[PDB]
Antibody, heavy 223, light 215 residues
Framework: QLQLQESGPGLVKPSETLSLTCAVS????????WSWIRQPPGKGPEWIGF????????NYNPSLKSRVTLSKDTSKNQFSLKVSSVTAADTAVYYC?????????????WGPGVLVTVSSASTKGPSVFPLAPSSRSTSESTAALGCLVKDYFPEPVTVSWNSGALTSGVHTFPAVLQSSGLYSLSSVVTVPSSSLGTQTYICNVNHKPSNTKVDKRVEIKTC | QSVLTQPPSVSGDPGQRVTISCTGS?????????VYWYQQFPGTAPKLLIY???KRPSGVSDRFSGSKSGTSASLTITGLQPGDEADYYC???????????FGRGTRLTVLGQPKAAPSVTLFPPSSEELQANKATLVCLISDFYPGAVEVAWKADGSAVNAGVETTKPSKQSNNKYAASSYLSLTSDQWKSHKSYSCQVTHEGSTVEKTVAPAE
């Protein structure tokens, strides 16, 4: 029932210091080794290092030894990674993982993984526009409600519907890279056509790098 | 020495046996450090499949087996299902570097996936994005197996050159592909023309959707 929750900025300017924190719930830091792994989008995993949960012992990747630092706060039951002199080669999805205390190196519990982007551009919150229900494309008496997420500089944007209550029929498409460097995506959801007027639909957009949280209701524009 | 080499991709028929190799050296697994096999789906953390070269955790199907010989390990999958399409990595300890190393990855693919025609949904702009001068046509394309797909936009009759941004096709959970094309337009451009069309071409077949600025 171990739960790892990752916190930290999504955007880091070059030559700055990236700082990530893995908070552990349902278990203590002691009794295990705690590791940081990173995966550049399109590549495989790379081991950054781990820290002992009981003692002060830490081990790092030799290729990253001079820039990375792992620490732990036992009072808050969490650990942390910091990477100095960050460049574009450090853009990746960062996971925290658990490893048994023994001298074996298998990772069985992983965190969600926070995307970290190293760019000189500024963060831009998303503009969210509802997409009125269209039934020409959908089949068997159902419509498709949409939400368009336009012009947000970092990549991770999460979209849910009805505060996570509506899950079936939801499809969030991969984002597009505008010529201005900003990202845009669309989240569509197929709903029963005979339920448009009686059921309210709200798309929840969360863009954590800009700390922006919008909730746009998709009301029927035409009929 | 001190590297884990994997094939970039392996292919096999459904229901048959396939093997993924992991080539080490004398420092990592000629050392006898265990080979570990992780499975990862798009947009998910790596899931641990094999440890100690043949051991499966609780909750891993018996169709995944591991073997180790000399400086080479192998992950064998029998009775290939479409759900086995993922990325497979091998990891091992290295005493020369004193570090955990991963392989660059193997992309597994089954060969028995039939062709699928794409479904297309065209959303016109709303007054919200119109008055904010963020008006854009949204063309969502989904559920087509052959990843290759070509997108064009038409202004009444005529190809639109500028304002179009088309994503690369991406695998969804059902192993089919999805993509989207956004056409950016100003309010004058939207109100001036009579209709805009998104045309999606896939394996010699065409699906065209059209919208009007009516009111």
């Amino acid at each position: 029932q171990l739960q790892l929750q990752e916190s930290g900025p999504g955007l880091v300017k070059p030559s700055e210091t990236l700082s990530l924190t893995c908070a552990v719930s349902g278990g203590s830091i002691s009794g295990y080794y705690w590791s940081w792994i990173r995966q550049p989008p399109g590549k495989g995993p790379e081991w950054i290092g781990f820290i002992d949960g009981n003692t002060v012992g830490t081990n790092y990747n030799p290729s990253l030894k001079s820039r990375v630092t792992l620490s732990k706060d036992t009072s808050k039951n969490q650990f942390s990674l910091k990477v100095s002199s960050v460049t574009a080669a450090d853009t990746a999805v960062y996971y925290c993982a658990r490893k048994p205390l023994r001298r074996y190196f298998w990772f069985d519990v992983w965190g969600p993984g926070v995307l970290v982007t190293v760019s000189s551009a500024s963060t831009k919150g998303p503009s969210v526009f509802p997409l009125a229900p269209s039934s020409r494309s959908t089949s068997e008496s159902t419509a498709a409600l949409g939400c368009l997420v336009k012009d947000y500089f970092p990549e991770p944007v999460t979209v849910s519907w009805n505060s996570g209550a509506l899950t079936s029929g939801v499809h969030t498409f991969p984002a597009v890279l505008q010529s201005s460097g900003l990202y845009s995506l669309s989240s569509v959801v197929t709903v029963p056509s005979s339920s448009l007027g009686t059921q309210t639909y709200i798309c929840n957009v969360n863009h954590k790098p800009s700390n922006t949280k919008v909730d746009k209701r998709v009301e029927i524009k035409t009929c | 020495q001190s590297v884990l080499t994997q094939p970039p991709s392996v292919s096999g028929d459904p229901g048959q046996r396939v093997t993924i190799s992991c080539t080490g050296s004398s420092s990592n697994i000629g050392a006898g450090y265990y080979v570990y096999w992780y499975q990862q789906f798009p947009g998910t953390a790596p899931k641990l499949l094999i440890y100690q070269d043949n051991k499966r955790p609780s909750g891993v199907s018996d169709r995944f087996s591991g073997s180790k010989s000399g400086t080479s390990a192998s992950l064998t999958i029998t009775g290939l299902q479409p759900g086995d399409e993922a990325d497979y990595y091998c990891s091992a300890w290295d005493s020369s570097l004193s570090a955990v190393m991963f392989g660059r990855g193997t992309r597994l693919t089954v060969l028995g996936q039939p062709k699928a025609a794409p479904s297309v949904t065209l959303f016109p702009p709303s007054s919200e994005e119109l008055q904010a001068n963020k008006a854009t046509l949204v063309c969502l394309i989904s559920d087509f197996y052959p990843g290759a797909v070509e997108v064009a936009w038409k202004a009444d009759g005529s190809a639109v050159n500028a304002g179009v941004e088309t994503t690369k096709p991406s695998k969804q959970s059902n192993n089919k592909y999805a993509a989207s094309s956004y056409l950016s337009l100003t309010s004058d451009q939207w109100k001036s023309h009579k209709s805009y069309s998104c045309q999606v071409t896939h394996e010699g077949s065409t699906v065209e959707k059209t919208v009007a600025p009516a009111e």
